[PDB]
Amino acid sequence: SQLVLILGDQLSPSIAALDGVDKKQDTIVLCEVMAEASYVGHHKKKIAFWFSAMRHFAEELRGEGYRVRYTRIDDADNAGSFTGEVKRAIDDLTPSRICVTEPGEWRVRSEMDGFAGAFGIQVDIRSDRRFLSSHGEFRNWAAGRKSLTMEYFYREMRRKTGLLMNGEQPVGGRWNFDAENRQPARPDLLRPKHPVFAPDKITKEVIDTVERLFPDNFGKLENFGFAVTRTDAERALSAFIDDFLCNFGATQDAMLQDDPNLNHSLLSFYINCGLLDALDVCKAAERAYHEGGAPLNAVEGFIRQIIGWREYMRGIYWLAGPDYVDSNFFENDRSLPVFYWTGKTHMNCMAKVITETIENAYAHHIQRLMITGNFALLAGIDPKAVHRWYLEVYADAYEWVELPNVIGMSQFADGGFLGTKPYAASGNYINRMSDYCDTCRYDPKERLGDNACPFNALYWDFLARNREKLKSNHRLAQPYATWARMSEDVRHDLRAKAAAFLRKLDAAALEH
């Protein structure tokens, strides 16, 4: 008989490990196991989402006729590790083999590589076919290139899937419509509200348990609205296609104080644990285009984020190896400011985004990149500490997708390995793309003096102190030219102002 192990982010009835299961003799094993349980950064809503999502999946599998062994977070016998739980399961079920789908984390994959020797039983680790490229295919793709860029890989995924393909030509005569998706947005108070799902009996029980076992963890549990069933996740997909997809590209980079969601889909939490399938989501958007529900620049832009970025990050993560997390191109050692955990900062943009993170366990892409990520980059934060924050505070966070977004795209801590450019930006960018500055005590137009937006001096200081490593970068040529034409006294005053702000950070850090 088989022991079929299914992990917390593999909540799909077509997951590879269920291939060829004998429903009457095999047993599916689901275990609420948290290796980092004592890390208080993990958002309470994320933990509640994990476990509620997993308990509904166990019930769904039983309704399908499977035999399911379930261990809760609060079970007295919970061994606290996948190995310990698999050992407890072997004792009950006396299987002749273990089937499991390859995990999405370096550390968990290695642990499972040890099952065969630790238990003396056959172990079959199956390739996770929810991704379009195997590890080997992606490695061979990268070997033929020398400089990796997402856009090359995306073109290959467009051909492999057929999405928005007319034979071997892209639908509409163009591969990518990003150029049309970059304007700022004014508020639109008729934009519909996003779907929320009231907690059912199982979710309320998880919510109470999380409050009881992680009382001092980051984040609020109030107004938990995540879908936790396959059917409700699809209701969230439907809501996005009917209400927001047609305007998705229009506002893709915009930020608004009173609208935390704009036209984003808010489906990442569901795709990443298996309640939605990535290719099914793209096909839904593609259908919307042919039925006239959305324009091409919006549909292609949406699909590019999933079979382009999301599939690319997965390949980068496995190709870069376990020690990618140690990338530190600029040699930063500064710790993460405590206001990333509290929101208690006078920078209005940072305050609002961190607050939304506290309350919702979600922020949309341009806030992760250009607000909290940009600040950490400019401030010279240790990239590993930035990594820990993003992995812990967002409900769609898993290492394989978060790490290449933090190490590569946001912090440039790999020196540009995945092909992006440095996203350093001054307060002038935030003032154009958002209305955060309108109610901020600081002034985005000032770089010196007590009123000045902190991003302005920090932007120049970042460029100045990293000049040897960045001067050849084409996209920074104009900024470095402007810098070299300032007087020595102006350059000196900008760096002294930046030092004074970094000093405020260091003095607070050397409290705790």
Ligand SMILES: Cc1cc2nc3c(=O)[nH]c(=O)nc-3n(C[C@H](O)[C@H](O)[C@H](O)COP(=O)(O)OP(=O)(O)OC[C@H]3O[C@@H](n4cnc5c(N)ncnc54)[C@H](O)[C@@H]3O)c2cc1C
């Ligand atoms: C510092 C940083 C950390 C990030 N951490 C994560 C993370 O932990 N988990 C995560 O899923 N995404 C992460 N991203 C990518 C992106 O910000 C989120 O996927 C997005 O905000 C999810 O919101 P949404 O579902 O409304 O996406 P939408 O704006 O509706 O985008 C549609 C879908 O495309 C995918 N997608 C879009 N952008 C990216 C991207 N850059 N990389 C991978 N997939 C993408 C997601 O599946 C998303 O659901 C990160 C980006 C940055 C800059």
Ligand code: SF4
């Ligand atoms: S002024 Fe500087 S700090 Fe205040 S909001 Fe605009 S960008 Fe953020």
